[PDB]
């Protein structure tokens, strides 16, 4: 006579059955049955100063919208990296080994913000 179709949650079942509703953990449980919160595990909101800011939620109807051009890897490379290499190549002071000079990173290890595997949230 049990309901097979409704979702299985902790409001159901006996006392000893418990599970989470999706909130992230913020601490650890030791022996002696004591909870110990960790400060670094609690998310911190980075809020900017909004004094003197000119932008608002809405825009005027008379503002012309622009043709859509999604950014691509090619476009970013040309705007930022291409000019410096071109000047150095003309001078002849360019080599493959020193690509790091132009901003290339060999590996993501050591960086606080790693691009793969991502180690930070939105």
């Amino acid at each position: 006579g049990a309901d097979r179709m409704s979702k299985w949650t902790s409001k159901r079942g006996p006392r000893t059955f418990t599970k989470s509703r999706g909130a992230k953990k913020t601490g650890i449980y030791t022996s002696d049955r004591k909870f110990v919160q960790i400060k670094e595990m609690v998310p911190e909101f980075v809020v900017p100063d909004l004094t003197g800011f000119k932008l608002k939620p809405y825009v005027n109807y008379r503002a012309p919208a622009g043709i859509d051009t999604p950014l691509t890897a090619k476009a970013l490379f040309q705007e930022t990296v291409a000019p410096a290499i071109e000047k150095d190549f003309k001078e002849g002071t360019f080599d493959a080994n020193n690509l790091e000079k132009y901003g290339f990173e060999p590996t993501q290890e050591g960086k606080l913000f790693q691009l793969y595997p991502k180690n930070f949230p939105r």
Binding site: V46, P48, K54, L55, K56, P57, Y58, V59, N60, Y61, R62, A63, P64, L76, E79, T80, V81, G103, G110, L112, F113, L115, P117, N119, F120
Partner: protein, 201 residues
């Protein structure tokens, strides 16, 4: 849903909810397919009624239901109905338009009003322009007021609307940095600790 029927009233309106309930299973309406490129009638145009009770007259197009191949003409193909009826009051008689199919009207040459067939063609820029087969001329795209009722030119900014000049200001400087990295630098936050190794699998 396959059993949805498109009608005069706007989709999502109170009347539309009443006519198309979830449990309605009426026969489909058979509609000839017309390509998006080939469609050549737009709101604000002037057309001529080839046949019907009001055959021979000309009017302005006020609505277009693409799904049904419908074109609605102001003050034509008309019948009479009371509006605002209540339990006591009769209401006020008005004249109601009825939709006409696309093949039942023809576009009118602007220079001298007369039915004309048209062909799409490319200009120097390649933007498509309607061209009349007879007495070749370009029929310009008409201008129609926005449905929502907004008039851009007369629009006046409110307290929470950004000015046009502010909206178009360009402040982006391309660089190989994430949004997270930039914000920390500007705000002055300093962190030196690093995550221990984690195994992904």
């Amino acid at each position: 849903s396959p059993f949805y029927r498109y009608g005069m009233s706007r989709p999502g309106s109170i009347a539309d909810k009443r006519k198309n309930p979830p449990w309605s299973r009426r026969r489909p309406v058979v509609v000839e397919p017309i390509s998006d490129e080939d469609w050549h009638l737009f709101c604000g145009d002037m057309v001529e009624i080839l046949e019907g009770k009001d055959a021979g007259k000309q009017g302005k197009v006020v609505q277009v239901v693409r799904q049904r191949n419908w074109v609605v003409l102001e003050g034509l193909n008309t019948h009479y109905r009371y509006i605002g009826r209540t339990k006591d009051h009769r209401g006020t008689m008005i004249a109601s338009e009825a939709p006409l199919l696309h093949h039942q009207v023809k576009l009118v040459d602007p220079v001298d009003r007369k039915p004309t067939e048209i062909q799409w063609r490319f200009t120097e820029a390649g933007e498509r322009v309607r061209v009349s087969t007879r007495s070749g001329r370009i029929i310009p795209k008409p201008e129609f007021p926005r449905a929502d009722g907004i008039v851009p030119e007369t629009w006046t900014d409110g307290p929470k609307d950004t000015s046009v000049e502010d909206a178009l200001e360009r402040t982006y400087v391309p660089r190989l940095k994430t949004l997270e990295e930039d914000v920390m630098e500007a705000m002055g936050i300093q962190e030196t600790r690093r995550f221990k190794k984690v195994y992904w699998y």
